[PDB]
Write a structure and sequence with these properties.
Layout (H helix, E strand, L loop, with lengths): L4 E4 L3 H17 L13 H10 L7 H20 L3 E5 L5 H12 L5 E6 L2 H14 L4 E6 L15 E5 L9 H13 L6 E7 L4 H7 L6 H16 L9 E8 L4 E8 L3 E5 L4 E5 L4 E8 L3 H10 L3 E7 L5 E7 L1
Helix pairs in contact: 2-8, 3-4
The structure holds Pyrrolidinohistidine.
PDB class: transferase
Keywords: ergothioneine, inhibitor complex
Assembly: monomeric
C-alpha cells in the first residue's frame, strides 16, 4: 500500500530552465536538434508505451523473452538481495527479476530510480502489494546526474534495460558507464540491455512503423515545446524520418519541414526559420556489436561475467562487475 521512502532531487524550476536552455541552443544551431529527454511528458510516455507493443518494434519483447527464459540464471549469478532499477519499475521485466529473487529467497529490497515522482509512488504501491515485507526506497533523479544518490544498502543488482544506454552518444555514454561503475561495491552487479546491429531494413522499420505511432511520438516533442515555451510549431508541417547511419551504426530520428516554416518561441523571445526540406535531429539510437559491448564495459572499469542473447542475435544482456 503506502509504505515508502522517497528522496527527490528534481525541481520543476530546474527542469523548466533546462528545457529553455536546450531548446534555445538546439534551435539556433545551424544543424537544428532537440534532446530526446523531452519526448517523455505524459502524452509522450503513453506513446512510447504503445511503441513497445508495435509489431515492428522488436526490442522490448525480445529483451523480455531473454529475461523470461534466463531470469533464474541472472539472479543466481548476481546473488543480489536488492534490485536497483534505473527506470520506472512498471514493466513485466521488473517482476520477472523480482519473482526470481523471491524464488531464490534473496529478495529484501527494491530501489526504483526515475524522473517522475508520481510513477515511483505508483510502483511502490504495486510492488509493495505484490511482495509484502519488501523494503522500497525510491529515488527521484536524473540517471546522468544523481547516481551518487542511490543507497549502497545491501548487495545490489543495478539494472539498465531497453537499450536506454543506446540513446546516449559515445562521450556521454562512456561518462555514464564510468560514473555508474564508480558507485558499485564488491558484490554489486550491473545488468545492461543493448540492442544489436542487424538487418538495416528491420532497424529502420522499428523506428518508422506502418501505423505512424513513432511519427506521432517524434512530432510530440514539438507539442511539448509549443505548450511549455509558447511556440507555434505546425506539427502537420513536419515529416517523420528514420535513418540508418552506417558510419556510427545508429538509428536517427529526424523531423523534416515539408515547406518553409517560421517558428516563434515566445517564452525565449526567439524566432527561427526552417527551409523547405530542412531536417532537425531529435534522437539517436545506437546499435551495438557484442565484442564492443565488452570493450565499452571494460573501459568503464567493468568486467562482463555473463552474456545472454536471443537465438536470432537481435538483442543482448550483459552482467558486469568491478
Ligand atoms: O531507442 C529506443 O529504442 C527507445 C526510444 C525510441 C523508441 N522508438 C523511437 N525512439 N529508447 C527509449 C528508452 C529505451 C530505448
Amino acid at each position: 500500500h503506502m509504505a515508502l521512502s522517497l528522496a527527490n532531487y528534481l525541481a520543476a524550476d530546474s527542469a523548466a530552465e533546462a528545457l529553455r536552455r536546450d531548446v534555445r541552443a538546439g534551435l539556433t544551431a545551424t544543424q537544428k536538434s532537440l534532446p530526446p529527454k523531452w519526448f517523455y511528458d505524459a502524452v509522450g510516455s503513453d506513446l512510447f508505451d504503445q511503441i513497445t507493443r508495435l509489431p515492428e518494434y522488436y526490442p522490448t519483447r525480445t529483451e523480455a523473452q531473454i529475461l523470461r527464459t534466463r531470469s533464474a540464471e541472472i539472479i543466481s549469478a548476481a546473488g543480489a538481495d536488492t534490485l536497483v532499477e534505473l527506470g520506472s519499475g512498471t514493466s513485466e521485466k521488473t517482476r520477472m527479476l523480482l519473482d526470481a529473487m523471491r524464488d531464490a529467497e534473496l529478495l529484501r529490497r527494491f530501489i526504483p530510480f526515475d524522473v517522475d515522482a508520481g510513477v515511483l509512488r505508483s510502483a511502490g504501491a504495486a510492488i509493495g502489494a505484490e511482495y509484502p515485507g519488501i523494503e522500497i526506497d525510491a529515488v527521484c533523479g536524473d540517471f546522468e546526474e544523481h547516481l551518487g544518490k542511490i543507497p549502497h544498502v545491501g548487495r545490489r543488482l543495478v539494472v539498465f534495460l531497453g537499450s536506454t544506454i543506446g540513446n546516449l552518444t559515445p562521450a556521454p555514454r562512456a561518462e555514464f558507464l564510468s560514473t555508474l561503475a564508480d558507485t558499485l561495491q564488491p558484490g554489486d552487479s550491473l545488468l545492461l540491455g543493448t540492442d544489436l546491429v542487424k538487418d538495416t531494413g528491420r532497424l529502420v522499420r522499428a523506428y518508422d512503423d506502418a501505423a505512424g505511432v513513432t511519427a506521432a511520438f517524434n512530432r510530440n516533442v514539438l507539442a511539448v515545446v509549443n505548450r511549455e515555451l509558447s511556440a507555434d510549431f505546425d506539427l502537420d508541417a513536419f515529416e517523420h524520418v528514420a535513418k540508418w547511419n552506417s558510419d556510427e551504426e545508429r538509428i536517427e530520428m529526424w523531423l523534416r519541414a515539408r515547406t518553409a516554416q517560421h517558428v516563434r518561441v515566445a517564452a525565449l523571445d526567439l524566432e527561427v526559420d526552417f527551409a523547405a526540406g530542412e531536417e532537425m535531429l531529435t534522437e539517436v539510437s545506437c546499435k551495438f556489436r557484442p565484442e564492443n559491448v565488452v570493450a565499452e564495459l571494460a573501459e568503464a572499469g567493468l568486467r562482463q561475467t555473463h552474456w545472454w542473447t536471443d537465438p536470432a542475435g537481435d538483442f543482448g544482456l550483459s552482467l558486469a562487475v568491478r
